[PDB]
Amino acid sequence: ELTPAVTTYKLVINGKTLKGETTTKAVDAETAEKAFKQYANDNGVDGVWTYDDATKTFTVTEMVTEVPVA
């Protein structure tokens, strides 16, 4: 391999208003994670994440910010 070997990673977004899937190509999982976290935040989705190295898939589940209701 003379050239950088890139892998395709997937992101599943389970958000309040953003939903779906996207992909990115990166040299490693760490790079893909950084790209995905940046994308999610830029799009107003912040939450809890999972990653499966077997499927090269990250999932973000958005955490809702609610106010009290007495």
PDB file of N, CA and C in Angstrom:
ATOM      1  N   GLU A   1       0.863  -1.182   0.000  1.00  0.00           N
ATOM      2  CA  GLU A   1       0.000   0.000   0.000  1.00  0.00           C
ATOM      3  C   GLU A   1       0.916   1.254   0.000  1.00  0.00           C
ATOM      4  N   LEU A   2       0.910   1.903  -1.153  1.00  0.00           N
ATOM      5  CA  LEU A   2       1.741   3.146  -1.279  1.00  0.00           C
ATOM      6  C   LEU A   2       0.917   4.285  -0.677  1.00  0.00           C
ATOM      7  N   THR A   3      -0.379   4.158  -0.874  1.00  0.00           N
ATOM      8  CA  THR A   3      -1.310   5.192  -0.410  1.00  0.00           C
ATOM      9  C   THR A   3      -2.112   4.830   0.808  1.00  0.00           C
ATOM     10  N   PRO A   4      -2.532   5.885   1.518  1.00  0.00           N
ATOM     11  CA  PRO A   4      -3.341   5.724   2.735  1.00  0.00           C
ATOM     12  C   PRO A   4      -4.578   4.865   2.416  1.00  0.00           C
ATOM     13  N   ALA A   5      -4.777   3.863   3.235  1.00  0.00           N
ATOM     14  CA  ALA A   5      -5.913   2.918   3.139  1.00  0.00           C
ATOM     15  C   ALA A   5      -7.043   3.461   4.008  1.00  0.00           C
ATOM     16  N   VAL A   6      -8.147   3.788   3.357  1.00  0.00           N
ATOM     17  CA  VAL A   6      -9.288   4.359   4.067  1.00  0.00           C
ATOM     18  C   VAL A   6     -10.413   3.338   4.194  1.00  0.00           C
ATOM     19  N   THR A   7     -11.108   3.443   5.314  1.00  0.00           N
ATOM     20  CA  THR A   7     -12.244   2.587   5.633  1.00  0.00           C
ATOM     21  C   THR A   7     -13.513   3.460   5.632  1.00  0.00           C
ATOM     22  N   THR A   8     -14.609   2.842   5.306  1.00  0.00           N
ATOM     23  CA  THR A   8     -15.896   3.567   5.340  1.00  0.00           C
ATOM     24  C   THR A   8     -16.509   3.281   6.709  1.00  0.00           C
ATOM     25  N   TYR A   9     -16.903   4.438   7.362  1.00  0.00           N
ATOM     26  CA  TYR A   9     -17.598   4.262   8.664  1.00  0.00           C
ATOM     27  C   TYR A   9     -19.002   4.839   8.509  1.00  0.00           C
ATOM     28  N   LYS A  10     -19.895   4.369   9.328  1.00  0.00           N
ATOM     29  CA  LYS A  10     -21.294   4.787   9.231  1.00  0.00           C
ATOM     30  C   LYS A  10     -21.676   5.417  10.633  1.00  0.00           C
ATOM     31  N   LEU A  11     -22.643   6.303  10.466  1.00  0.00           N
ATOM     32  CA  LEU A  11     -23.198   6.941  11.694  1.00  0.00           C
ATOM     33  C   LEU A  11     -24.711   6.854  11.571  1.00  0.00           C
ATOM     34  N   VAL A  12     -25.314   6.369  12.634  1.00  0.00           N
ATOM     35  CA  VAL A  12     -26.755   6.282  12.718  1.00  0.00           C
ATOM     36  C   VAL A  12     -27.121   7.424  13.763  1.00  0.00           C
ATOM     37  N   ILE A  13     -28.031   8.240  13.317  1.00  0.00           N
ATOM     38  CA  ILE A  13     -28.428   9.382  14.213  1.00  0.00           C
ATOM     39  C   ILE A  13     -29.862   9.107  14.661  1.00  0.00           C
ATOM     40  N   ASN A  14     -29.948   9.002  15.987  1.00  0.00           N
ATOM     41  CA  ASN A  14     -31.279   8.808  16.609  1.00  0.00           C
ATOM     42  C   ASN A  14     -31.512  10.084  17.432  1.00  0.00           C
ATOM     43  N   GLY A  15     -31.874  11.168  16.767  1.00  0.00           N
ATOM     44  CA  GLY A  15     -32.040  12.487  17.401  1.00  0.00           C
ATOM     45  C   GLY A  15     -33.485  12.932  17.501  1.00  0.00           C
ATOM     46  N   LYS A  16     -33.623  14.079  18.209  1.00  0.00           N
ATOM     47  CA  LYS A  16     -34.951  14.639  18.444  1.00  0.00           C
ATOM     48  C   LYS A  16     -35.552  15.049  17.093  1.00  0.00           C
ATOM     49  N   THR A  17     -34.760  15.811  16.326  1.00  0.00           N
ATOM     50  CA  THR A  17     -35.243  16.242  15.027  1.00  0.00           C
ATOM     51  C   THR A  17     -34.375  15.756  13.862  1.00  0.00           C
ATOM     52  N   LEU A  18     -33.138  15.471  14.167  1.00  0.00           N
ATOM     53  CA  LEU A  18     -32.279  14.912  13.060  1.00  0.00           C
ATOM     54  C   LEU A  18     -32.311  13.355  13.230  1.00  0.00           C
ATOM     55  N   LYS A  19     -32.586  12.754  12.051  1.00  0.00           N
ATOM     56  CA  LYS A  19     -32.679  11.251  12.074  1.00  0.00           C
ATOM     57  C   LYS A  19     -32.046  10.758  10.752  1.00  0.00           C
ATOM     58  N   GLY A  20     -31.482   9.538  10.884  1.00  0.00           N
ATOM     59  CA  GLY A  20     -30.956   8.965   9.593  1.00  0.00           C
ATOM     60  C   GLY A  20     -29.605   8.362   9.751  1.00  0.00           C
ATOM     61  N   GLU A  21     -28.942   8.311   8.584  1.00  0.00           N
ATOM     62  CA  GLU A  21     -27.598   7.758   8.517  1.00  0.00           C
ATOM     63  C   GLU A  21     -26.707   8.474   7.514  1.00  0.00           C
ATOM     64  N   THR A  22     -25.483   8.557   7.827  1.00  0.00           N
ATOM     65  CA  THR A  22     -24.463   9.169   6.981  1.00  0.00           C
ATOM     66  C   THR A  22     -23.200   8.345   7.062  1.00  0.00           C
ATOM     67  N   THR A  23     -22.244   8.700   6.247  1.00  0.00           N
ATOM     68  CA  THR A  23     -20.958   7.957   6.280  1.00  0.00           C
ATOM     69  C   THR A  23     -19.794   8.918   6.146  1.00  0.00           C
ATOM     70  N   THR A  24     -18.608   8.419   6.371  1.00  0.00           N
ATOM     71  CA  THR A  24     -17.357   9.124   6.183  1.00  0.00           C
ATOM     72  C   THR A  24     -16.255   8.094   5.886  1.00  0.00           C
ATOM     73  N   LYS A  25     -15.225   8.547   5.250  1.00  0.00           N
ATOM     74  CA  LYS A  25     -14.071   7.612   5.031  1.00  0.00           C
ATOM     75  C   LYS A  25     -12.942   8.195   5.865  1.00  0.00           C
ATOM     76  N   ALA A  26     -12.255   7.382   6.622  1.00  0.00           N
ATOM     77  CA  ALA A  26     -11.143   7.757   7.476  1.00  0.00           C
ATOM     78  C   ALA A  26     -10.127   6.617   7.553  1.00  0.00           C
ATOM     79  N   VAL A  27      -8.959   6.995   7.996  1.00  0.00           N
ATOM     80  CA  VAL A  27      -7.854   6.077   8.155  1.00  0.00           C
ATOM     81  C   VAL A  27      -8.059   5.142   9.319  1.00  0.00           C
ATOM     82  N   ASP A  28      -8.788   5.605  10.332  1.00  0.00           N
ATOM     83  CA  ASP A  28      -9.020   4.751  11.521  1.00  0.00           C
ATOM     84  C   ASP A  28     -10.300   5.179  12.234  1.00  0.00           C
ATOM     85  N   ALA A  29     -10.684   4.372  13.203  1.00  0.00           N
ATOM     86  CA  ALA A  29     -11.914   4.590  13.945  1.00  0.00           C
ATOM     87  C   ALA A  29     -11.851   5.895  14.756  1.00  0.00           C
ATOM     88  N   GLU A  30     -10.693   6.212  15.265  1.00  0.00           N
ATOM     89  CA  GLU A  30     -10.518   7.429  16.108  1.00  0.00           C
ATOM     90  C   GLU A  30     -10.797   8.670  15.270  1.00  0.00           C
ATOM     91  N   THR A  31     -10.265   8.669  14.065  1.00  0.00           N
ATOM     92  CA  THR A  31     -10.490   9.817  13.152  1.00  0.00           C
ATOM     93  C   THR A  31     -11.954   9.964  12.824  1.00  0.00           C
ATOM     94  N   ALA A  32     -12.612   8.824  12.573  1.00  0.00           N
ATOM     95  CA  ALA A  32     -14.036   8.770  12.200  1.00  0.00           C
ATOM     96  C   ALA A  32     -14.892   9.274  13.366  1.00  0.00           C
ATOM     97  N   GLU A  33     -14.490   8.904  14.556  1.00  0.00           N
ATOM     98  CA  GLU A  33     -15.219   9.310  15.773  1.00  0.00           C
ATOM     99  C   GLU A  33     -15.179  10.853  15.890  1.00  0.00           C
ATOM    100  N   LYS A  34     -14.024  11.397  15.713  1.00  0.00           N
ATOM    101  CA  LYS A  34     -13.840  12.893  15.790  1.00  0.00           C
ATOM    102  C   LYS A  34     -14.666  13.571  14.751  1.00  0.00           C
ATOM    103  N   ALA A  35     -14.717  13.056  13.519  1.00  0.00           N
ATOM    104  CA  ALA A  35     -15.510  13.673  12.446  1.00  0.00           C
ATOM    105  C   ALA A  35     -16.984  13.630  12.713  1.00  0.00           C
ATOM    106  N   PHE A  36     -17.446  12.525  13.254  1.00  0.00           N
ATOM    107  CA  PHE A  36     -18.816  12.255  13.576  1.00  0.00           C
ATOM    108  C   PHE A  36     -19.276  13.116  14.772  1.00  0.00           C
ATOM    109  N   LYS A  37     -18.407  13.199  15.739  1.00  0.00           N
ATOM    110  CA  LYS A  37     -18.787  14.029  16.947  1.00  0.00           C
ATOM    111  C   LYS A  37     -18.910  15.465  16.512  1.00  0.00           C
ATOM    112  N   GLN A  38     -18.025  15.912  15.673  1.00  0.00           N
ATOM    113  CA  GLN A  38     -18.053  17.333  15.169  1.00  0.00           C
ATOM    114  C   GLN A  38     -19.308  17.566  14.378  1.00  0.00           C
ATOM    115  N   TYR A  39     -19.616  16.675  13.412  1.00  0.00           N
ATOM    116  CA  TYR A  39     -20.850  16.738  12.630  1.00  0.00           C
ATOM    117  C   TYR A  39     -22.054  16.781  13.535  1.00  0.00           C
ATOM    118  N   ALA A  40     -22.151  15.907  14.520  1.00  0.00           N
ATOM    119  CA  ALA A  40     -23.345  15.845  15.361  1.00  0.00           C
ATOM    120  C   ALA A  40     -23.520  17.243  16.074  1.00  0.00           C
ATOM    121  N   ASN A  41     -22.483  17.625  16.707  1.00  0.00           N
ATOM    122  CA  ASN A  41     -22.551  18.960  17.465  1.00  0.00           C
ATOM    123  C   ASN A  41     -22.907  20.071  16.509  1.00  0.00           C
ATOM    124  N   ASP A  42     -22.276  20.175  15.369  1.00  0.00           N
ATOM    125  CA  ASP A  42     -22.576  21.238  14.393  1.00  0.00           C
ATOM    126  C   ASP A  42     -24.037  21.294  14.032  1.00  0.00           C
ATOM    127  N   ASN A  43     -24.702  20.159  13.995  1.00  0.00           N
ATOM    128  CA  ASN A  43     -26.068  19.969  13.648  1.00  0.00           C
ATOM    129  C   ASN A  43     -26.984  19.986  14.851  1.00  0.00           C
ATOM    130  N   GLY A  44     -26.460  20.366  15.992  1.00  0.00           N
ATOM    131  CA  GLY A  44     -27.209  20.463  17.235  1.00  0.00           C
ATOM    132  C   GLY A  44     -27.632  19.181  17.886  1.00  0.00           C
ATOM    133  N   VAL A  45     -26.942  18.081  17.655  1.00  0.00           N
ATOM    134  CA  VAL A  45     -27.207  16.785  18.240  1.00  0.00           C
ATOM    135  C   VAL A  45     -26.023  16.455  19.144  1.00  0.00           C
ATOM    136  N   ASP A  46     -26.325  16.261  20.396  1.00  0.00           N
ATOM    137  CA  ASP A  46     -25.308  15.911  21.421  1.00  0.00           C
ATOM    138  C   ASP A  46     -26.040  14.846  22.239  1.00  0.00           C
ATOM    139  N   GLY A  47     -25.314  13.787  22.584  1.00  0.00           N
ATOM    140  CA  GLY A  47     -25.948  12.694  23.314  1.00  0.00           C
ATOM    141  C   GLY A  47     -24.919  11.625  23.709  1.00  0.00           C
ATOM    142  N   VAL A  48     -25.501  10.435  23.786  1.00  0.00           N
ATOM    143  CA  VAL A  48     -24.716   9.237  24.199  1.00  0.00           C
ATOM    144  C   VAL A  48     -24.408   8.401  22.883  1.00  0.00           C
ATOM    145  N   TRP A  49     -23.207   7.860  22.981  1.00  0.00           N
ATOM    146  CA  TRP A  49     -22.741   7.165  21.724  1.00  0.00           C
ATOM    147  C   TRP A  49     -22.375   5.682  21.975  1.00  0.00           C
ATOM    148  N   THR A  50     -22.446   5.039  20.791  1.00  0.00           N
ATOM    149  CA  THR A  50     -21.924   3.609  20.768  1.00  0.00           C
ATOM    150  C   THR A  50     -21.085   3.536  19.474  1.00  0.00           C
ATOM    151  N   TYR A  51     -20.197   2.545  19.510  1.00  0.00           N
ATOM    152  CA  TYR A  51     -19.420   2.250  18.291  1.00  0.00           C
ATOM    153  C   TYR A  51     -19.280   0.696  18.212  1.00  0.00           C
ATOM    154  N   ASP A  52     -19.498   0.202  16.974  1.00  0.00           N
ATOM    155  CA  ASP A  52     -19.234  -1.292  16.843  1.00  0.00           C
ATOM    156  C   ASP A  52     -18.096  -1.422  15.817  1.00  0.00           C
ATOM    157  N   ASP A  53     -16.990  -1.944  16.296  1.00  0.00           N
ATOM    158  CA  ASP A  53     -15.820  -2.089  15.423  1.00  0.00           C
ATOM    159  C   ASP A  53     -16.081  -3.217  14.391  1.00  0.00           C
ATOM    160  N   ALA A  54     -16.977  -4.092  14.746  1.00  0.00           N
ATOM    161  CA  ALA A  54     -17.319  -5.210  13.804  1.00  0.00           C
ATOM    162  C   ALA A  54     -18.056  -4.681  12.593  1.00  0.00           C
ATOM    163  N   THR A  55     -18.933  -3.715  12.764  1.00  0.00           N
ATOM    164  CA  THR A  55     -19.754  -3.141  11.718  1.00  0.00           C
ATOM    165  C   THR A  55     -19.311  -1.740  11.266  1.00  0.00           C
ATOM    166  N   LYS A  56     -18.302  -1.190  11.879  1.00  0.00           N
ATOM    167  CA  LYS A  56     -17.737   0.134  11.597  1.00  0.00           C
ATOM    168  C   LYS A  56     -18.908   1.154  11.658  1.00  0.00           C
ATOM    169  N   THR A  57     -19.709   0.956  12.690  1.00  0.00           N
ATOM    170  CA  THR A  57     -20.865   1.860  12.863  1.00  0.00           C
ATOM    171  C   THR A  57     -20.878   2.518  14.279  1.00  0.00           C
ATOM    172  N   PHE A  58     -21.076   3.844  14.168  1.00  0.00           N
ATOM    173  CA  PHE A  58     -21.319   4.673  15.390  1.00  0.00           C
ATOM    174  C   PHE A  58     -22.818   4.997  15.403  1.00  0.00           C
ATOM    175  N   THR A  59     -23.328   5.115  16.654  1.00  0.00           N
ATOM    176  CA  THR A  59     -24.727   5.531  16.803  1.00  0.00           C
ATOM    177  C   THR A  59     -24.679   6.712  17.872  1.00  0.00           C
ATOM    178  N   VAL A  60     -25.503   7.675  17.537  1.00  0.00           N
ATOM    179  CA  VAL A  60     -25.617   8.786  18.626  1.00  0.00           C
ATOM    180  C   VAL A  60     -27.093   8.836  18.924  1.00  0.00           C
ATOM    181  N   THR A  61     -27.386   8.895  20.252  1.00  0.00           N
ATOM    182  CA  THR A  61     -28.785   8.970  20.669  1.00  0.00           C
ATOM    183  C   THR A  61     -28.826  10.379  21.375  1.00  0.00           C
ATOM    184  N   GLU A  62     -29.683  11.203  20.804  1.00  0.00           N
ATOM    185  CA  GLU A  62     -29.701  12.591  21.377  1.00  0.00           C
ATOM    186  C   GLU A  62     -30.396  12.540  22.723  1.00  0.00           C
ATOM    187  N   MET A  63     -29.838  13.401  23.591  1.00  0.00           N
ATOM    188  CA  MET A  63     -30.407  13.547  24.953  1.00  0.00           C
ATOM    189  C   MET A  63     -31.151  14.889  24.973  1.00  0.00           C
ATOM    190  N   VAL A  64     -32.412  14.769  25.283  1.00  0.00           N
ATOM    191  CA  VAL A  64     -33.334  15.897  25.356  1.00  0.00           C
ATOM    192  C   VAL A  64     -33.068  16.754  26.603  1.00  0.00           C
ATOM    193  N   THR A  65     -33.176  18.063  26.398  1.00  0.00           N
ATOM    194  CA  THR A  65     -32.983  19.031  27.529  1.00  0.00           C
ATOM    195  C   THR A  65     -34.356  19.565  27.870  1.00  0.00           C
ATOM    196  N   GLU A  66     -34.902  19.049  28.972  1.00  0.00           N
ATOM    197  CA  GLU A  66     -36.237  19.505  29.375  1.00  0.00           C
ATOM    198  C   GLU A  66     -36.125  20.391  30.629  1.00  0.00           C
ATOM    199  N   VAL A  67     -37.167  21.141  30.863  1.00  0.00           N
ATOM    200  CA  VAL A  67     -37.298  21.994  32.077  1.00  0.00           C
ATOM    201  C   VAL A  67     -38.397  21.348  32.922  1.00  0.00           C
ATOM    202  N   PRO A  68     -38.383  21.650  34.219  1.00  0.00           N
ATOM    203  CA  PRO A  68     -39.369  21.062  35.138  1.00  0.00           C
ATOM    204  C   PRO A  68     -40.786  21.483  34.851  1.00  0.00           C
ATOM    205  N   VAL A  69     -41.726  20.660  35.312  1.00  0.00           N
ATOM    206  CA  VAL A  69     -43.151  20.871  35.094  1.00  0.00           C
ATOM    207  C   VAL A  69     -44.070  20.597  36.232  1.00  0.00           C
ATOM    208  N   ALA A  70     -43.856  21.268  37.385  1.00  0.00           N
ATOM    209  CA  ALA A  70     -44.775  21.090  38.521  1.00  0.00           C
ATOM    210  C   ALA A  70     -46.057  21.867  38.202  1.00  0.00           C
TER     211      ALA A  70
END
